[PDB]
Design a protein around this nucleic acid. Structure first.
Ligand SMILES: Nc1ncnc2c1ncn2[C@@H]1O[C@H](COP(=O)(O)OP(=O)(O)OP(=O)(O)O)[C@@H](O)[C@H]1O
Ligand SMILES: Nc1ncnc2c1ncn2[C@@H]1O[C@H](COP(=O)(O)OP(=O)(O)OP(=O)(O)O)[C@@H](O)[C@H]1O
Ligand SMILES: [K+]
Ligand SMILES: [Mg+2]
Ligand SMILES: [Mg+2]
Ligand SMILES: [Mg+2]
Lengths: 405, 386, 351, 591, 199
DNA sequence: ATTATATATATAT
DNA sequence: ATATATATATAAT
């Protein structure tokens, strides 16, 4: 159906405010009590919140939404968003604050002696909330001037200000300087994924569920029931265990559900256990084994020689002349007269491997050395070599015999 | 005009992921594959077929971060409808929302396909996370594609990023290559006549090449040689063992000559239609680089692992030992040593000092030395090893 | 209520008019500046210490009391300048700021330097001496060299965080970190007339912070958050609330991040530990760690790991800084170091 | 003034009115012999040099064969783009020689040839100002303009603007010098916009054409269409039209010739250094000889004889060639010449025409001898006109025994071979007109008119032997030869190439040679000359050995501080580098 | 022994004083031949044993008295080809600016020389074999300076292996004229900086 | 492979 | 146009 695809494509791709919170309640309480205290009083506080995909932008957006429904709040609060990937300098960062506070007409051509004097005139023309998304890249500026000026204006000035800080770094209080550390109230909120696998199974049913404001109720009843029957199936639980064994992040699950929904149309109205099984295979693909399947026959013959070099002269780099000499014994003695190709063609096979980056320079110096006699290292492990040879579509008989021997 | 052959299921994955126009797709898809497996062709034809407003950008072309941003911006402003300038990535995101709010583009899925993605990492550290998370940043219903030839785990930055859903274009097999090549027929001959030519051509050339681009070019050039016995009248279309025996030895010379670009394709079409002190000093460095210093005294006074760097005081000592005459240490003979370096026949290593920097190497092959030795009537073989 | 005035008092911005425990330094600064203002002579001062001592507040009380003495006609009147190093965009902008503060005219930095050199009862204040450093060290040197001239009649006060600073330039009054007694005096001093805290919480907070660092802002924030966690349990702020607060602001979340991890990343960390036991070094390539990790996944019973998935596992562990890894542009050559100690990892994985 | 904590010491003549400059040739006048002789010698030098530069450049222009093939290739490859993918960029690989210096004219000459025939836009790039892709493209767009962050879309927009048809030609002078990265990038970007930007690339290659494979890998080398194009022959022509013609008055001796030929064949092929060599010799010849104003065109040289200073007339009298010439004469003729300068003037005007007519006689017989010589197999005297010129200038050829074996070989030629030889020899006489050998041209035509073979053949052999004995003769046996000749062999040799290391090696081992004051016959030496000969090296013992020697030769510490300076002098020279195996252990001479 | 000792230790007697006092005049004869050959497109390097700076400074006092000459000392420790370019481009032209590149500055110098023939500059280099100027790029900048017609150059090399810094393309940029000038005065000023780095 | 110096561009004075 | 910060190249560790 059209509207089901619309709602869960907004839910899983363009990640959107939804009411459900799993295992972040005390964290939500501390953040809410803080923004309430900063938004109502003249109090100022600072926060450093969690690894990737752990719902950092989820939790703040609900809280500001919940705060904004208060009629007194919505009249007299101004928000400013700054991301650490967009604004990599304080000059770019200072321009955004004048624009987002709608004071770009007010400031005009006025000249300010200092960075703080520019920020001081802005605030004096009603609390203000600052949100600093992806905070660890603000802390790699030259002198952390934006970090100091936001904390100092919070700690001393009367104007109420909140500095919420969003990072992925557990060692976040070792990249900041001493003086900013002293002005930072050490208020840590931890949205770490502390929930179990039975709790992980319950989330699987709830996120793949249509809401109650859906018009056509009779399809919505049987769709919700069909989720309930599949949620208890043993077949879905083995691949759900595999993905839970990799990661407890819900973004990997939202990757799984979109590809399983990809196979639902008017001809296939309800999901099947086969669809989730087929969805698991695409995400679990191994990248390096796929490339070796698509190499040429001669390109396979080089890497087995390069495998054979690292078992004798262990952890020692090798050049082309190491490789070509090893290849010559296999053509003249081990196998047969065919594949005794010339020296200029085998160069292309080596020059195509380095283009695909299965082989990396030990030392990179362009122009200093020749195409041959350049020390090179194999980036492909021995485990991936033997498995890929077995699944090669028509691998020649003696070539695989050389690989084992 | 353009038809995709033996790419059905992968394509169906692409329009399945695309969906309808108002729907929100993945923020980032990263497509990886070999040298020719329909990365450019399938994606470009599929975006043009559905009339989805899309921008195709080569990354190698735009060598500067700046060049890449207006190239996306200008091409989208043609699609909606003078010159928009943006320097940093922040001004790109602000202006991208400005161009997308036009009436044709407010409720559709705008695509930015990028080709040759292995160079984007060298440009800047924060560019590659910028495009992967672009739909969350811009909030304008955007999908970004990544055409590349390298696996995803190399692309991953150290600090982490949004993860793209990884697809694979599968390699063409030996039958799969055959159907694509036997589609664009030459009109004057039959359909089964051209297929048997493809059958024998892949007989020689599948071993060294599974590239579609190379084999199609090799198929065009040797086709006049294949069809000349029937034109002369010795054979017919049903005399297959006549036709394959004419092209049999001809193709085993194409692999050495045309395939390695020694004789160019322009020549190969026409060929069937027509039916003193510098000489010693390079020898001296070759004896300097490729010999141990312990046996130096034995050879003169009375190759694998590559070059070994040598001092100049060893070099000049060998030079006076092989020239059977008094040689003055003139300015030119010291000027002539560094003429070989700038000509790349020699190379200095280290660069610690220049006049008191004795280090050099002899970067030239064995065959180049044996003719110069033969020119001046000198025996390079006698001094190399016993 | 009762607690809301405790929040109002405990706020860092509410500096008191009379500061406890910094009265001798107040008098000594006051005597040095009164020995230099009344006789119309130019001198120099340097002050340093750890950031939490209270330098700016005490010298601001100094400049206020001289201003009040100036209003009462006790001393000849003085015009006042204050500049902070962190706030400025550029190190050379000090000259243009001193120029506009003293005179109406504005100029470029080198023109301002020449006008200030030609110009020299003004009382300079320079916080944050460290960031005005240049490889010329010209700004630092002429900041010391300007007031020592009869035309100048300038007194310079300086604030920094390393005491051994003005030797490398080619007196040093000092401020000490707070101990138990001064800190407990401050904490009772802000809540002198409100019955809101128990003294056992006061001594635990003061003892903990003076044991760790010796800062004031840390104490005021731990007390303000302790009032919050007491307000959840509804009074009187007991020992339990402050004990919960002190390990809500001082405990490290490295080990609890290790606890709540998935199965395969913990297996990866166990593989790192085992490979370090086998080697004895701090350096181990990604191939060596993976060669142990496949054996661990074999023995535990996990499905056999692909390397393009263990690479994602290693990148996720590096992104949260539990490991130290190279950027992944090279693969199979990633030498890994444990960012955390072996004992914390063995404490976290055992349960 | 030259010493401060800085590296710039420029002096300026400001604040004083000396804006007027000193004209050139005021420094030429080093010895006061005549003031006005020097000005005329410098004018004759300038005229002869500009003539030899013009006839160098015109001859290098004539040696058109190469450009005809390249112009045809340029038009043919663009005929495909005229008709209209994966088009290969057509490229031309010009193999220029090892003579790196010569390439500037060779690349310079090709510019106006292409600019006149096929294309109006030809530009040149060098690696010295192209390190990266931003710099490689910025230089290209600026040179394209006359004939903002520009890109390849800037190139295509410019091309549509100015054409509203012809190809753009871009030549790379030194492909060895270019970095690998920028070459691999430029080929790929240009190929995908071949539809709106037609590009054809010419590469200046110096080495054999295998350099393309090393710099450019196979994945890029198949996007090009490589076609190949291609000093000993250039040198023989330029020697003939500068020295073996009578149009230029100046000549050189055999030892001066031997010096200049040896730097070319042995060290490095460079015809511009040969041009450099004779330009110094022309400068040195009008400097050492005062009466070298007579080295000009012959009607002017007789005019110069008429008006002279009296010291110049005495200067004419003291030539060794002149002194040998007056001695052979009668008794009365000697006192006729020595006393009266007017009788000297008329005799000299005859002798310069005897000098001039001989040089008209000389080479036009050498050209005929080569036509015999190059026909003969096994080439005894030489196969080249440069080699044959050397062996007869040094000494008479028949007086050497090498010429007799040539005569014995020349007797054994068949009838057909002689018909080719005497056809060419008669053609040589017709080629150079106003030749002073009339009867000979007739008898070479009479021998051709004649066509018992063996008896007439010996006349044909004895034709050439008598002729060369008349005219081939070394010019040291001719009076007033010095007026157009220069023999300072060591003076030219050391100036072009000398040996600094033997200047170091001789002086240290032998103090006596530049201080001829019994300083050495087989201790007493300057400070660098004692410490050198001691070593040919731990510094404590090396200090003792110096302290042993210098005290023998001559509370002080004078001897120890000398050891400090005269080893730090030596490590400034290329001898001493400190090491850590001992306190010092180094030997960088070993020769 | 410490370096301070030599300043009071100025009591060394030359042994063969009379005969070395003869080779300053004989090489003073060769001044005018050099001064001839500079104007016509050649260049001079002095090759020998001794300290050629004495004959070079003797050449300045006698000859270049009414010219815009420059003296370059490579034996100075903090010397660069950057400094050699900066001396000309700020003082000789009377220009007051900075340049983005050594190559762009070199282009501005060569183009300003090509525009006007009225300027003549004499580029004296006492030591070109010092390790700062030993660079092929530095010698390339000096050779692109040297090839012009309105600029002149005298040089001296002390090193045993000194022609390493010229190949065939640079032996064409410098039109060298080689001169045996072996005075036997000792290296005094240029050994001063080197005396520090050992005992 | 990283760190230091030189250099190329960009930005602020 | 001077000066400084950032980016890239070359050189040394
Ligand atoms: N406990 C949870 N409750 C509800 N939703 C969750 C929870 N954990 C994860 N999610 C979902 O996973 C996604 C998390 O990504 P989100 O955009 O919120 O920020 P993030 O990716 O954690 O932060 P960053 O982008 O800075 O790494 C959201 O769509 C969210 O709905
Ligand atoms: N399904 C198909 N049917 C017909 N032709 C095809 C098909 N797939 C690819 N081709 C042809 O193969 C050629 C090369 O394919 P493509 O341009 O996708 O290479 P590529 O993989 O993008 O190259 P690279 O890996 O270097 O980026 C195209 O010119 C196209 O005509
Ligand atoms: K010159
Ligand atoms: Mg987020
Ligand atoms: Mg492609
Ligand atoms: Mg302070």
């Amino acid at each position: 159906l059209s509207q089901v695809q619309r709602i869960l494509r907004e839910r899983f791709c363009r990640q959107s405010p939804h009411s459900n919170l799993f295992g972040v309640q005390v964290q939500y309480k501390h953040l809410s009590e803080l923004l309430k205290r900063t938004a109502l009083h003249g109090e100022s506080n600072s926060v450093l919140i969690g690894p990737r995909g752990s719902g950092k932008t989820m939790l703040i957006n609900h809280a500001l939404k919940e705060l904004m429904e208060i009629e007194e709040v919505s009249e007299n609060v101004l928000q400013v968003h700054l991301n650490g990937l967009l604004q990599i300098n304080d000059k770019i960062a200072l321009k955004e604050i004048t624009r987002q506070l709608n004071l770009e007409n007010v400031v005009g051509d006025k000249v300010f002696g200092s960075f703080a004097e520019n920020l001081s005139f802005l605030l004096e023309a009603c609390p203000v909330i600052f949100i600093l998304d992806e905070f660890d890249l603000f802390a790699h500026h030259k002198n952390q001037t934006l970090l100091y000026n936001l904390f100092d204006i919070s700690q001393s000035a009367q104007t109420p200000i909140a500095v919420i800080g969003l990072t992925c770094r557990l060692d976040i209080l070792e990249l900041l300087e001493k003086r900013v550390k002293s002005r930072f109230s050490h208020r840590q909120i931890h949205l770490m994924n502390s929930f179990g696998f039975p709790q992980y199974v319950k989330i699987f049913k709830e996120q793949l569920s249509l809401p109650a404001e859906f018009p056509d109720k009779v399809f919505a009843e049987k769709w919700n029931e069909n989720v309930q029957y599949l949620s208890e199936d043993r077949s879905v639980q083995e691949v759900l265990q595999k993905h839970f064994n990799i990661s407890k992040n819900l973004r990997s699950l939202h990757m799984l559900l979109m590809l399983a929904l990809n196979r639902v149309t008017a001809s296939h109205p309800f999901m099947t256990a086969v669809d989730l099984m087929e969805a698991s295979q695409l995400c679990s693909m191994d990248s390096k084994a796929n490339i070796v399947h698509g190499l040429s026959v001669l390109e396979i013959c080089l890497i087995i020689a390069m495998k054979h070099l690292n078992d004798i002269y262990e952890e020692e780099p090798f050049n082309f002349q190491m490789v070509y000499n090893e290849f010559q014994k296999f053509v003249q003695r081990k196998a047969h007269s065919v594949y005794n190709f010339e020296k200029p063609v085998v160069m292309k096979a080596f020059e195509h491997l380095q283009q695909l980056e299965l082989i990396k320079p030990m030392e990179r110096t362009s122009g200093n050395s020749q195409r041959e006699y350049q020390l090179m290292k194999l980036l492909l492990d021995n485990t991936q070599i033997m498995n890929a040879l077995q699944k090669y579509p028509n691998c020649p008989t003696d070539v695989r015999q050389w690989a084992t021997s | 005009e353009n038809v995709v052959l033996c790419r059905e299921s992968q394509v169906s994955i692409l329009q399945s992921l695309f969906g309808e126009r108002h729907h929100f797709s993945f923020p980032s898809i990263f497509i990886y594959g070999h040298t020719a497996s329909g990365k450019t062709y399938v994606t470009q034809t599929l975006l043009k077929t559905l009339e989805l407003p899309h921008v195709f950008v080569n990354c190698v072309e735009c060598f500067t971060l700046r060049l890449l941003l207006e190239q996306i911006l200008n091409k989208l402003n043609h699609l909606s409808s003078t010159e928009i300038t943006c320097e940093t990535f922040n001004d790109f995101v602000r202006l991208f929302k400005q161009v997308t709010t036009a009436e044709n583009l407010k409720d559709q899925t705008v695509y930015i396909v990028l080709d040759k993605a292995e160079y984007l990492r060298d440009m800047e550290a924060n560019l590659l996370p910028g495009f992967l998370r672009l739909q969350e940043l811009a909030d304008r219903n955007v999908t970004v594609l990544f055409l590349s030839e390298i696996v995803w785990e190399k692309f991953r930055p150290n600090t982490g990023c949004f993860e793209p859903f990884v697809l694979y274009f599968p390699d063409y097999s030996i039958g799969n290559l055959q159907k694509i090549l036997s589609h664009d027929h030459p009109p004057e001959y039959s359909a089964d006549f051209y297929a048997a030519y493809i059958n024998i051509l892949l007989g020689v050339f599948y071993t060294v090449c599974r590239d579609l681009k190379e084999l199609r070019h090799l198929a065009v050039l040797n086709f006049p040689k294949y069809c000349e016995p029937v034109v002369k009248g010795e054979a017919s279309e049903r005399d297959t063992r006549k036709l394959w025996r004419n092209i049999e030895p001809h193709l085993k010379k194409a692999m050495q000559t045309v395939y390695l670009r020694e004789i160019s394709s322009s020549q190969w079409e026409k060929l069937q239609k027509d039916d003193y002190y510098s000489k010693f000093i390079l020898i001296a460095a070759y004896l300097a680089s490729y010999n141990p210093a312990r046996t130096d005294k034995r050879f003169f006074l009375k190759h694998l692992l590559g070059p070994k760097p040598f001092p100049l005081d060893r070099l000049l000592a060998i030079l006076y030992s092989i020239v059977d005459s008094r040689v003055a240490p003139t300015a030119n003979i010291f000027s002539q040593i560094t003429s070989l370096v700038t000509l790349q026949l020699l190379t200095l290593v280290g660069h610690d000092d220049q006049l008191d920097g004795p280090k050099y190497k002899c970067t030239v092959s064995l065959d180049f030395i044996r003719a110069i030795a033969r020119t001046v009537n000198f025996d390079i073989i006698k001094y190399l090893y016993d | 209520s009762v607690l809301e005035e405790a929040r109002l008092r405990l706020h860092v911005s509410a500096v008191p008019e009379s500061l406890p425990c910094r009265e001798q330094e107040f008098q000594d600064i006051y005597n040095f500046v009164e020995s230099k203002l009344l006789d119309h002579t130019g001198g120099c001062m340097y002050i340093s210490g750890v950031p939490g001592t209270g330098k700016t507040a005490t010298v601001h009380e100094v400049i206020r009391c001289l201003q009040q003495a100036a209003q009462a006609n006790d001393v000849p009147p003085f015009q006042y300048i204050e500049v902070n190093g962190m706030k400025l965009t550029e190190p050379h902008q000090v000259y243009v700021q001193i120029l506009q503060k003293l005179t109406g005219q504005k100029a470029t930095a080198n023109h301002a330097a020449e006008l200030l050199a030609k110009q020299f009862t003004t009382v300079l204040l320079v916080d944050e001496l460290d960031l005005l450093w240049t490889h010329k060290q010209d700004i630092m040197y002429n900041l010391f060299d300007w007031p020592t001239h009869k035309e100048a009649r300038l007194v310079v006060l300086a604030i920094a965080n390393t005491m051994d600073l003005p030797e490398r330039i080619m007196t040093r009054m000092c401020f000490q970190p707070y101990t138990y007694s001064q800190l407990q005096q401050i904490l009772r001093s802000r809540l002198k007339h409100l019955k809101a805290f128990e003294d056992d919480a006061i001594q635990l907070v003061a003892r903990k912070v003076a044991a760790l660092s010796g800062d004031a802002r840390r104490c005021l924030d731990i007390c303000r958050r302790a009032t919050e966690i007491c307000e959840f349990s509804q009074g009187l702020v007991t020992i339990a609330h402050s004990m919960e607060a002190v390990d809500e602001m001082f405990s490290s979340s490295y080990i609890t991040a290790i606890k709540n991890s998935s199965v395969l990343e913990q297996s990866f960390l166990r593989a790192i530990l085992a490979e370090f036991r086998r080697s004895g070094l701090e350096e181990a390539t990604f191939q060596q760690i993976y060669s142990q990790h496949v054996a661990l996944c074999r023995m535990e019973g996990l499905p056999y790991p692909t390397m393009s998935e263990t690479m994602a596992v290693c990148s996720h562990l590096g992104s949260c800084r539990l490991l130290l890894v190279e950027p992944s542009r090279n693969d199979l050559l990633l030498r890994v170091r444990l960012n955390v100690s072996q004992d914390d990892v063995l404490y976290a994985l055992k349960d | 003034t030259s010493s401060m904590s800085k590296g710039c010491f420029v002096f300026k003549p400001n604040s004083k009115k000396r804006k007027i400059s000193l004209p050139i040739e005021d420094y030429f006048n080093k010895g006061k012999n005549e003031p006005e002789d020097s000005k005329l010698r410098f004018e004759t030098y300038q005229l002869i040099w500009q003539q030899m530069k013009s006839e160098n450049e015109r001859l290098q222009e004539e040696l058109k064969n190469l450009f005809d093939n390249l112009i045809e290739f340029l038009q043919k490859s663009h005929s495909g783009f005229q008709k209209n993918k994966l088009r290969e960029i057509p490229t031309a690989a010009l193999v220029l020689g090892v003579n790196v210096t010569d390439h500037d004219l060779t690349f310079g000459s090709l510019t106006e040839a292409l600019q006149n025939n096929v294309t109006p836009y030809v530009v040149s790039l060098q690696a010295k100002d192209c390190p990266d892709m931003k710099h490689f493209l910025q230089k290209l767009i600026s040179q394209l303009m006359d004939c903002t962050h520009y890109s390849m879309d800037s190139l295509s927009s410019w091309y549509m603007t100015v054409t509203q048809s012809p190809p753009v030609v871009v030549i790379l002078k030194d492909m060895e010098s270019f970095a690998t990265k920028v070459l691999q990038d430029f080929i790929i970007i240009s190929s995908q916009h071949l539809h709106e930007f037609p590009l054809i690339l010419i590469f200046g290659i110096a080495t054999s054409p295998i350099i393309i494979h090393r710099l450019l890998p196979h994945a890029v080398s198949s996007l090009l269409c490589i076609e190949l194009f291609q000093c000993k022959e250039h040198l023989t022509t330029v020697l003939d039209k500068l020295l073996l013609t009578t149009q230029f008055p100046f000549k050189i001796n055999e030892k001066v010739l031997q010096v200049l030929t040896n730097i070319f064949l042995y060290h490095d092929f460079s015809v511009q250094n040969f041009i450099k060599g004779l330009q110094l010799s022309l400068l040195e010849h009008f400097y050492s000889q005062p009466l070298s104003v007579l080295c000009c065109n012959l009607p002017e040289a007789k005019r110069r004889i008429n008006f002279l200073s009296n010291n110049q007339c005495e200067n004419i009298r003291r030539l060794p060639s002149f002194r040998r010439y007056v001695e052979k004469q009668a008794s009365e003729k000697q006192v006729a010449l020595l006393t009266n300068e007017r009788y000297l003037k008329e005799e000299t005007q005859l002798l310069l025409e005897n000098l001039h007519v001989y040089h008209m006689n000389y080479f036009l017989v050498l050209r005929c001898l080569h036509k015999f010589t190059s026909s003969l197999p096994k080439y005894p005297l030489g196969r080249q006109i440069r080699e044959l010129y050397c062996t007869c200038l040094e000494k008479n050829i028949w007086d050497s025994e090498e010429y007799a074996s040539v005569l014995q070989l020349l007797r054994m030629l068949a009838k057909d071979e002689l018909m080719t030889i005497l056809e060419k020899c008669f053609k040589v006489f017709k080629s150079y007109c106003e030749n002073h050998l009339g009867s000979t041209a007739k008898r070479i035509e009479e021998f051709l008119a004649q066509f018992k073979f063996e008896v007439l053949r010996e006349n044909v052999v004895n034709f050439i032997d008598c002729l060369v004995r008349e005219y081939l003769l070394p010019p040291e046996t001719q009076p007033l030869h010095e007026v157009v000749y220069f023999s300072a062999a060591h003076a030219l040799r050391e100036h072009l190439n000398a040996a600094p290391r033997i200047a170091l090696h001789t002086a240290l081992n032998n103090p006596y040679y530049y201080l001829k004051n019994e300083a050495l016959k087989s201790n007493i030496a300057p400070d660098i000359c004692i410490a050198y000969k001691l070593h040919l090296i731990n510094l404590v013992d090396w200090s003792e050995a110096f302290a042993t020697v210098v005290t023998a030769a001559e509370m002080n510490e004078i001897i120890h501080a000398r050891f400090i300076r005269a080893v730090s002098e030596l490590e400034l020279l290329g001898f001493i580098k400190p090491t850590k195996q001992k306190t010092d252990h180094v030997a960088r001479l070993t020769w | 022994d410490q370096q301070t000792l030599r300043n009071l230790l100025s009591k060394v007697s030359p042994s063969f004083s009379a005969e070395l006092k003869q080779l300053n005049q004989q090489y003073e004869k060769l001044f005018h031949k050099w001064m001839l050959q500079l104007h016509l497109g050649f260049n001079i390097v002095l090759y020998g044993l001794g300290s050629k700076r004495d004959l070079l400074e003797r050449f300045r006092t006698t000859m270049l008295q009414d010219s815009i000459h420059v003296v370059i000392n490579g034996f100075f420790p903090g010397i660069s080809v950057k400094s050699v370019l900066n001396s000309i481009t700020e003082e000789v032209l009377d220009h007051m600016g900075t340049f983005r590149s050594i190559l762009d500055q070199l282009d501005w110098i060569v183009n300003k020389f090509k525009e006007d023939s009225s300027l003549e500059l004499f580029l004296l280099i006492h030591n070109l074999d010092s390790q700062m100027l030993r660079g092929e790029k530095s010698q390339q900048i000096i050779g692109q300076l040297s090839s012009l017609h309105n600029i002149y150059l005298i040089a001296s090399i002390d090193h045993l292996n000194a022609p390493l810094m010229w190949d065939h393309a640079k032996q064409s940029l410098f039109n060298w004229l080689w001169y045996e000038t072996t005075t036997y005065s000792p290296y005094t000023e240029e050994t001063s900086y080197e005396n520090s780095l050992l005992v």
